[PDB]
Each structure stands twice: as C-alpha cells, then as structure tokens.
C-alpha cells in the first residue's frame, strides 16, 4: 500500500477538485 498510498493521495486530491464543484455550487444557487 507505495503505490495504496499515492491512490488514496490522488483520492485526496481528485475529493480537492469535489470541494473545488461544492466552491463553483455556493457561486449555482449565485
Ligand atoms: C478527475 C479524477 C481523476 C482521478 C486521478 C487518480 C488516478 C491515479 C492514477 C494512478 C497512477 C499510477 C502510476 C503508477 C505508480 C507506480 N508506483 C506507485 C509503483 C511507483
């Protein structure tokens, strides 16, 4: 779980740009 870890990392990263849809969303119903 070396390369477990940066899929988990890179999870983390791509549930970042999920967040980023939530940021873009509160300026959806703006
Ligand atoms: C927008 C959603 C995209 C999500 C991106 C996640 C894809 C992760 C791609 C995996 C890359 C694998 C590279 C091989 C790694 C080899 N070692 C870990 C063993 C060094």
Same mark, same amino acid.
């Given at each position: 779980?070396?390369?477990? @870890? %940066?899929?988990?990392? %890179?999870? @983390? +990263?791509?549930?970042? =740009?999920? =967040? !980023?849809?939530?940021? @873009?969303? !509160? +300026?959806?119903?703006?």
């Amino acid at each position: 779980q070396x390369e477990x @870890k %940066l899929x988990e990392x %890179l999870x @983390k +990263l791509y549930h970042x =740009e999920x =967040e !980023l849809x939530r940021x @873009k969303x !509160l +300026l959806x119903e703006x």
